Design an enzyme around this catalytic site. Sequence first.
Site, short mmCIF file in Angstrom:
data_model
loop_
_atom_site.label_atom_id
_atom_site.label_comp_id
_atom_site.label_asym_id
_atom_site.label_seq_id
_atom_site.Cartn_x
_atom_site.Cartn_y
_atom_site.Cartn_z
N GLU A 178 0.77 -1.30 -0.04
CA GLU A 178 0.00 0.09 0.02
C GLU A 178 0.82 1.39 -0.04
O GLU A 178 2.10 1.33 0.00
CB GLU A 178 -1.08 -0.07 1.09
CG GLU A 178 -2.08 -1.17 1.08
CD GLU A 178 -2.87 -1.15 2.19
OE1 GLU A 178 -4.03 -1.89 1.95
OE2 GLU A 178 -2.64 -0.80 3.16
N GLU A 203 -1.91 -10.37 -6.19
CA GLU A 203 -1.92 -11.12 -7.65
C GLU A 203 -1.04 -10.19 -8.46
O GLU A 203 -0.21 -10.92 -9.30
CB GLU A 203 -3.05 -11.11 -8.34
CG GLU A 203 -4.33 -11.70 -7.04
CD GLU A 203 -5.09 -10.67 -6.31
OE1 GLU A 203 -4.21 -9.99 -5.57
OE2 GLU A 203 -6.14 -10.24 -6.53
N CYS A 234 -7.19 -6.22 -10.82
CA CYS A 234 -6.45 -7.45 -10.72
C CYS A 234 -6.87 -8.56 -11.90
O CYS A 234 -6.05 -9.08 -12.55
CB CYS A 234 -6.23 -8.00 -9.47
SG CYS A 234 -4.74 -7.32 -8.54
O1 LIG Z 1 -7.50 -8.02 -5.81
C1 LIG Z 1 -7.32 -8.55 -4.31
C2 LIG Z 1 -8.49 -7.50 -3.79
C3 LIG Z 1 -7.73 -6.33 -3.19
N1 LIG Z 1 -6.50 -6.55 -2.34
C4 LIG Z 1 -5.85 -5.08 -1.88
C5 LIG Z 1 -5.13 -4.18 -2.17
C6 LIG Z 1 -5.14 -3.22 -1.24
O2 LIG Z 1 -4.00 -3.17 -0.33
C7 LIG Z 1 -6.17 -3.93 -0.07
C8 LIG Z 1 -7.53 -3.11 0.18
O3 LIG Z 1 -8.04 -3.01 -1.13
O4 LIG Z 1 -6.37 -5.42 -0.84
C9 LIG Z 1 -5.72 -7.50 -2.98
O5 LIG Z 1 -4.37 -7.36 -2.62
N2 LIG Z 1 -5.88 -8.33 -3.87
ZN LIG Z 2 -6.45 -6.26 -6.95
#
Ligand SMILES: O=C1CCN(C2C[C@H](O)[C@@H](CO)O2)C(=O)N1
Ligand SMILES: [Zn+2]
Lengths: 130, 130, 130, 130
Positions: free
Chosen positions: C44, C55, C89
């Site tokens: 983040e 992913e 993603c």
């Molecule tokens: O596609 C999935 C759902 C979203 N999250 C994320 C990015 C972010 O840091 C957090 C909140 O959206 O989950 C993922 O890492 N992968």
């Molecule tokens: Zn994502």
Amino acid sequence: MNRQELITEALKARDMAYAPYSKFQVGAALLTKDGKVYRGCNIENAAYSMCNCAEATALFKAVSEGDTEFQMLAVAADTPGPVSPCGACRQVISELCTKDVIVVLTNLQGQIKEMTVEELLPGAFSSEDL
Amino acid sequence: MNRQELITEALKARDMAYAPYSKFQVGAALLTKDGKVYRGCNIENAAYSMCNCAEATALFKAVSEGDTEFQMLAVAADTPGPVSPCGACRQVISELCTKDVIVVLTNLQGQIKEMTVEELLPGAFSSEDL
Amino acid sequence: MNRQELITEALKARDMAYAPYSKFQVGAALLTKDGKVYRGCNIENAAYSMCNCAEATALFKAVSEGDTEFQMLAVAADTPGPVSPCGACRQVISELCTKDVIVVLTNLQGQIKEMTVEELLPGAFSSEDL
Amino acid sequence: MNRQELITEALKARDMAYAPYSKFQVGAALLTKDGKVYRGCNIENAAYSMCNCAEATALFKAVSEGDTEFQMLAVAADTPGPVSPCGACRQVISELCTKDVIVVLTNLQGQIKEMTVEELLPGAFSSEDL
Ligand SMILES: O=C1CCN(C2C[C@H](O)[C@@H](CO)O2)C(=O)N1
Ligand SMILES: [Zn+2]
Ligand SMILES: O=C1CCN(C2C[C@H](O)[C@@H](CO)O2)C(=O)N1
Ligand SMILES: O=C1CCN(C2C[C@H](O)[C@@H](CO)O2)C(=O)N1
Ligand SMILES: O=C1CCN(C2C[C@H](O)[C@@H](CO)O2)C(=O)N1
Ligand SMILES: [Zn+2]
Ligand SMILES: [Zn+2]
Ligand SMILES: [Zn+2]
């Protein structure tokens, strides 16, 4: 429409913000050459990468309406000092605004930092590089 | 304001697109419950990751104005079949539109695919997951 | 390297996550045709739109190494049901993985949903549309 | 591992780039305190907003591996002058690198611009603002 008046526009725009995840509302007011004002606010998403900033919202709004000549951009948020546009927004600003457009950065306590688009992101990556 | 009329709105919105990098213009028209229409178009940047899509522009515009109840979203682009919203846009749509909002996808040759927000991105990641 | 073993890889990858803003850690494990595993995690940023997903991290890692042929992708997060990849993603996955790649979605409680890249985002916007 | 050697790493990383849309390959090489090198390259998508930059790829790679202490970042692209990191990347860099990390910018013709993370994006929006 002086900068103080444009700041008030951004302060109002800020109240339209949809930021339930960060609880951090940002407002922006874009002044065109003809004196029209476009308000913008950040709009978030459960998937954080999809969040959109106030500055971008205002510019996207203006450009989508056919307004592409700006003179000033005010941005406001409840930050310690004048709100600092994130890198992505500075990039969008450097693309959609001419280098001499005035960027007025403020918070909710009268802190004011004024700079040009150029100063906002010096030597910004641009179409010329492509 | 039937879907054909909303499609015409999106087709007009498409002409406002700022897409000098992909030369791929997209238009979107968002219809609110009260019958107001918000037009959107894609807006690009030399730094590709900063590009904003038509669907997002329309929704950001509406939400920034305080309009949050929608009934239909039309999207148009010069694609082989009905234009397919990119994953990021489907994510923004799934957040800003209720599940039964009708999404009308079309191109510039009359191809029409109609689906709900839910069908657009089934089991979409949402605030509930956070 | 069956899916259960790939899931364990994703679970370990999840612990590397840098998500101080959402406090939502996600893990991903990408299996190549040759059987190599690439771990990914979300990372983040204070500026939310800059957040990167697990992913994507795994795929970016593999592709940057020259690995471009995959057979399976496991994703894990502490969600109610199998973690749902965000739209962005799914878009990245639909681009970097062939339609036959198996996507294994799970949470931290044994719930497992398995689907193909095609099923993850049917009719995904692609280069052919450009 | 002086900067000239890190630049060569970035130049090699650049060749792994997946940029069929812009045809603009970028390479990055991240040097950790312990002297390990992580290569990164840009990876594009038909949906432009999903494109990922070289700098980000390298940092995401390092962080996902548990490496979080860096000393230098080299970036290379075939631009007129030293390649300028896009705003989004400067934002990611300002988050994942300490202000003292040295950022070496270069092109494919020996032009070199060196600056700190702080200088890359002075007063960058950060967690403290949230
Ligand atoms: O596609 C999935 C759902 C979203 N999250 C994320 C990015 C972010 O840091 C957090 C909140 O959206 O989950 C993922 O890492 N992968
Ligand atoms: Zn994502
Ligand atoms: O560039 C500025 C700084 C970032 N914020 C945002 C987007 C997001 O909803 C929130 C937290 O990053 O502030 C803005 O809206 N504008
Ligand atoms: O979701 C749809 C598909 C993607 N395009 C975009 C953004 C970008 O300027 C261009 C190429 O990806 O089409 C849209 O505007 N909407
Ligand atoms: O920050 C720098 C400038 C932008 N490019 C990118 C991403 C994209 O694939 C291409 C065109 O924007 O260059 C980078 O990879 N790094
Ligand atoms: Zn921003
Ligand atoms: Zn889109
Ligand atoms: Zn970048």
